[PDB]
Design a protein around this ligand. Structure first.
Ligand SMILES: C/C(=N\CC(=O)O)C(=O)[C@H](O)COP(=O)(O)OP(=O)(O)OC[C@H]1O[C@@H](n2cnc3c(N)ncnc32)[C@H](O)[C@@H]1O
Ligand SMILES: C/C(=N\CC(=O)O)C(=O)[C@H](O)COP(=O)(O)OP(=O)(O)OC[C@H]1O[C@@H](n2cnc3c(N)ncnc32)[C@H](O)[C@@H]1O
Ligand SMILES: C/C(=N\CC(=O)O)C(=O)[C@H](O)COP(=O)(O)OP(=O)(O)OC[C@H]1O[C@@H](n2cnc3c(N)ncnc32)[C@H](O)[C@@H]1O
Ligand SMILES: C/C(=N\CC(=O)O)C(=O)[C@H](O)COP(=O)(O)OP(=O)(O)OC[C@H]1O[C@@H](n2cnc3c(N)ncnc32)[C@H](O)[C@@H]1O
Ligand SMILES: C/C(=N\CC(=O)O)C(=O)[C@H](O)COP(=O)(O)OP(=O)(O)OC[C@H]1O[C@@H](n2cnc3c(N)ncnc32)[C@H](O)[C@@H]1O
Ligand SMILES: C/C(=N\CC(=O)O)C(=O)[C@H](O)COP(=O)(O)OP(=O)(O)OC[C@H]1O[C@@H](n2cnc3c(N)ncnc32)[C@H](O)[C@@H]1O
Ligand SMILES: [Fe+2]
Ligand SMILES: [Fe+2]
Ligand SMILES: [Fe+2]
Ligand SMILES: [Fe+2]
Ligand SMILES: [Fe+2]
Ligand SMILES: [Fe+2]
Lengths: 259, 259, 259, 259, 259, 259
């Protein structure tokens, strides 16, 4: 005999949401993009006890991972990055005739990446678009957010804000946060040239160098890093994404400690 | 120094996918819909050692859970259904002034439901649409599948099939599998009247009665059950969905054992 | 020297909105539609001290009034209904060769109707769609609401609820609330035949008879009344809309007092 | 017993509309945009007895105010700008822990701003798009108007004109009037760089400096001012918009008196 | 009495497709575009025993040939190019008052061109989009592929790869492969100016000069050649297309033999 | 040194097209649909010396064959139907563990089917939609045709006609010709119930019985036959389609000879 009431359900949702919102509008780190790089970054920062929010446009997390390679629902990871997936429980299978190369179910990975982030203490908000940055003297000091619903519906409605010590552009190929900063504030002299064509080995190894603070308060990781610094793309192999996100976390953790 | 090759990445994805496909085209149970009811059903069946596939249209699982209530990212669960979420690790918080009523993060729940299903041994395939049924004498004997990409692109391309002992319509409000069966085979005398307006208590309690075998080989659970048997909708409270999915699993497990 | 902060602006909006929401989810009367009939009804009920919310799909109130007649930005009103517009401050100009017939600026009217409603104490919420009803034994006991943004974006997100003693369908030509009730709960034997063609005099006078309780807890007024009871349409003359809304208010006020 | 006739209704609308049109095609000031800055400007100019028309694309006035902040239906105002809203009857509530900061119902504000403008004598026309300017030797001498219906329908139909001594671009973020002037007449050497990212305090204070005559006969106010002069955006706080509109009015009133 | 089974049909399609895919991901030549130039090139290369794949976006081959001239279903060919169509069985009819000029059924030609390519040993894959290139030191070493379904559906899914010694852009007017190379890797200093207006004689004769290796590993033929080198277009006369494709084949065969 | 002229190219296309059109507007048989069933039917009728035209909506022939099964580019054929594909040169490969079952490249098949039809003397016109029938006393005496361009563009342009002794609906799942006849001429008492769900063996064997003259002058073959007579669908196995088309041809050849 289940017990359920409309008013109580509605009231409960409103109370949890409004408590959540009042808390989440000031954070240590706001990561933009709930793909593999962003969710990895979120886990490793939150793991150290800092207050982290991930903002993802789509209602589901996962970014461009779900469809694997051309719809074939597996993705690839190379050592030592496989270890990052093992930490969150992902089953990995060896590739035939290839040492240190593994495949994983493209549906399993996002789920487990997200759980890792949430259980480490990161808050993941979906249906939220970062449309701009909050600025202070010589730095990025937060994000300007709107709902995916409002964006996709095309309604003329103003955004609200989340204040952050650090922001991370983990938005994938488009590097949409860095792109917006550079476009609306041209006097900063930032440029997003976009990625080069596919060269997997060069692309993967460029990511670690390209994962860094682009402007004070704003880091970039994942494919966004190679868009900002013109690295090569690498196809459906994700070790670089995970290591990039992990590295981004370590850099930001260091800066948070120094203060 | 990361090691990566385009051919090896591509080859690896192809090999894992084609092994997966050759195995998955005959199953014990094909569940249609990767929402809360479908993912719960998948866990409880796979948990007993049977071969289960979930087929979900969208690239991400989770169904209509991600947005909580009107975008406020929390959902509600009432006892004893809260216990089903605790089994998969979901954090629950008590609702103020309400006994046996809990809220949960609307992003956390789908992630953990999916992990539960997959770790129990269920295979979850996304970007797959069930467009029809495979029939035998007096029963449903499988599903007719196409890709979401092909559907959304509008391309005129034929489906393939997955053979199953049992099929479950866990497709939500539309009851799209039962609806298709009844529409294309009118001589079966099936009808999908659709749900009634909102009455949460009546809706929740109708679900258990409405979770059943609609035609031999075809079960229904979740909101689809109330669409097929004209139960009330209940709003953003999910205990009924979880219990319905669990019950559906138990019914089907019993039938599989009897054979 | 203006003082402004992002966090404070955001916090302030969140606090006012969440206080508003927690209060508004239980009301005496929920009026659906912020057109001329709905806004008039709202004023006359709130004026008597009852707790009223108007729910309007579009971000602006006003319904189908703004464009006047075929874009010519004037609407017409006939006595004694002109008196209802005078009560909210609308300037009226006599029509040449016609006694008891006036024109009014089609932009002025909605503005002043809305102010009248708000200053009488009615809450007007825009960007909100009533998609269904909350039911109890033999009656309508509230509304099921979602955002226009979510509807127009096509996102699969559950609604929340507002509990009410009375609901009013003031949704215009479509009578969308009565239509939904009748469609989803066919055993109630309700039908919405839709309006007849234009006969202004017959249409206007049918409205008063057609303004009534269609099912316990659910009233209808404005053009919705003639859609439900197959009255004629009347063109860009609005006296009937105002009187219908006023009458609807009086009927509901009486029922609230009797309890 | 209501009296209504189709021919009389139609005739009445035609007569009022055509009288209105013949009068409105020559004005002192044509304000483009019926948002908060434009409606404030309109009130303060009309208040001094000058002939003002506001031209707004959408059928409703209000611009980007209705949805508050990310759909939460409240907006913020800081002193002394709160006084401008009090003049038109808006209820304001103090923000907790913040002096000189208030919230207001995002539906109430547009309604009351519009009433203020109309009751001061400004004419507000909606469903009208300014697509270009009328030019004379070294100045803007009017606006080129079409209907929103014609624009949105994509029909190839010529515009008509309203002659004005002064035109005001109060079109918001896009600064669409100044942008069009600069694009079609490049030899004027005007440029619209567009706004910078969010810095609320700097954005708000830049508005007063940025509210000015961009080219003889053409003023800019509201967010359009910061688009033209590359000021920062400020989020859902509106004091700057109101003060900008008020200042724009005072500047133009002075110029009208000097002649 | 026909014999048919769902599982066997599905299994058979999966086995043939996965064998095909594992073989086709490394080739001698990957031709992009299954129009007249691409299909001619494919025949003449495969004819010499090399491993060739043609990748075509649309589900059918044929490119822009099917509609003839403005829907009139005939195309034109001039000597000696007519001989290339005779080799694949196309019926040709002399044009009245014109020596060495022939018409052919615009539906017959693509069919026979495709058969010629396939029977020579070329594999033609349709519904496949080349979205990028695989690069090595100073050359193009393969293609980055996705499905047309995924592209047209707008899904965020990663591509896979086909390794090749040589790639051919036979994509028609857009020269989409060379364009992508030049856009994403600007430091290569490639440019695609696009075709000039129509001058048939000059356009046809420019093609042979313009058919060449644009960058090491990447050839161009057909209309793509005149887009890359700013040749004139020629209208619905195709001799240049066939000769260009044939020449492209000969050049690449020579390079393959030299190694 | 290629010779090409714009006027001569244009003139040549016009002359061939207009000769073609003047000839093709009266035929023995008009087959609607250039899929596998229609192209097979066309070959076997034209082979006997009769005047046949195939009318296909899309610019390419092939119907729903190109994509194989869910994009995997192979289709299946069972004996003795494999013999029909061997007659037109298609390479077939045996399915492992299955006697009398073969796979074929889904791109090769349409090409070779089309060549078979054309070389047998059938005219195939693409980009042509049959929108209606020409009627005489108790029979269908031709087809009403428009262009796909006109249909897809939505232009209000009248059709023209092709006179035929027999018309064949080979339009696939929709049975669009029979459907149109039955819809517009209800007094004929025709009905198109549509196909049943998938049962491959029953679907394949129903086709031969269902391939027949539905109304005097109008035959049906391919999947259209099972739509008209409520047979089962069979998935991506095509033997039934080929045999159905062949049988349709034989029936019509017999009727032509008897006259
Ligand atoms: C390896 C690879 N490609 C190789 C190749 O193509 O050769 C990939 O594409 C990987 O998926 C890249 O992973 P990565 O974590 O870098 O990005 P992703 O998966 O695309 O995730 C980014 C996420 O960010 C989201 N997003 C975008 N912009 C915004 C915004 N302004 N606000 C909120 N969210 C936003 C977007 O929806 C997405 O979920
Ligand atoms: C409680 C509630 N509502 C109360 C109220 O509204 O008042 C809900 O709406 C719940 O979300 C319902 O849960 P439930 O597990 O029943 O369904 P869901 O969440 O909608 O998930 C079903 C899933 O099934 C998917 N789906 C649909 N049809 C197909 C198809 N033919 N093939 C593949 N997948 C398909 C669809 O994408 C969706 O993800
Ligand atoms: C006199 C006349 N016509 C004569 C003739 O045509 O001959 C008119 O059309 C009048 O405008 C009718 O006035 P009335 O007050 O009856 O309606 P209106 O102006 O159309 O306002 C109704 C409002 O209700 C809104 N609405 C609709 N459905 C929903 C929903 N389900 N939830 C939330 N809001 C909804 C809708 O957006 C609209 O704004
Ligand atoms: C404070 C803030 N943002 C902060 C932030 O984003 O960080 C805002 O966006 C405010 O709403 C800005 O107020 P403001 O009065 O400047 O503009 P608004 O509200 O956008 O109103 C302008 C109106 O003008 C209209 N309009 C546009 N272009 C034309 C045209 N060519 N002809 C006719 N009308 C037109 C347009 O439809 C709109 O209604
Ligand atoms: C003579 C003439 N015009 C004269 C005039 O207009 O004056 C023509 O237009 C001829 O058709 C040109 O023949 P040609 O073989 O050069 O090209 P085509 O017929 O357009 O075929 C190219 C094919 O290539 C395809 N394609 C494009 N881009 C991609 C991609 N990125 N990946 C996969 N396939 C792609 C495209 O779909 C098309 O089918
Ligand atoms: C076996 C199978 N399915 C099994 C399953 O799904 O379970 C199939 O779908 C097969 O492709 C069916 O082959 P068949 O030759 O019957 O049909 P098809 O391939 O769909 O070809 C019909 C053609 O006819 C065309 N067409 C449609 N209507 C019109 C019109 N009014 N005028 C002109 N042409 C038209 C249409 O565009 C199409 O190209
Ligand atoms: Fe704004
Ligand atoms: Fe089919
Ligand atoms: Fe729901
Ligand atoms: Fe013009
Ligand atoms: Fe990618
Ligand atoms: Fe006609």
């Amino acid at each position: 005999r289940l017990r359920a009431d409309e008013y109580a359900t509605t009231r409960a949702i409103l109370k949890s949401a409004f408590d959540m919102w009042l808390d989440i509008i000031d954070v240590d780190v706001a990561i933009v993009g709930g793909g593999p790089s962003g969710l990895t970054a979120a886990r490793y920062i939150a793991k150290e006890g800092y207050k982290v929010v991930v903002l993802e446009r789509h209602l589901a997390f996962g970014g461009g991972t779900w469809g694997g390679g051309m719809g074939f629902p597996y993705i690839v990871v190379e050592e030592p990055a496989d270890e990052i997936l093992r930490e969150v429980g992902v089953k990995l299978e060896k590739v035939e005739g290839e040492d240190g190369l593994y495949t994983a179910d493209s549906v399993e990975v996002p789920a487990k990446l997200a759980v890792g982030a949430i259980d480490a203490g990161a808050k993941v908000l979906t249906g939220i678009v970062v449309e701009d940055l909050v600025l202070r003297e010589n730095r990025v000091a937060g994000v300007v957010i709107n709902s995916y619903a409002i964006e996709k519906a095309g309604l003329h409605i103003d955004p609200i804000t989340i204040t952050a010590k650090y922001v991370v552009d983990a938005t994938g190929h488009d590097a949409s946060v860095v792109t917006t900063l550079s476009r609306k504030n041209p006097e900063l002299g930032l440029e997003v040239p976009g990625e080069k064509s596919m060269w997997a080995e060069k692309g993967e190894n460029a990511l670690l160098r390209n994962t860094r603070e682009v402007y004070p308060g704003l880091f970039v990781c994942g494919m966004a890093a190679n868009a900002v610094y013109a690295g090569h793309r690498m196809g459906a192999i994700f070790g670089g994404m995970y290591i990039s996100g992990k590295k981004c976390a370590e850099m930001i953790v260091e800066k948070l400690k120094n203060n």
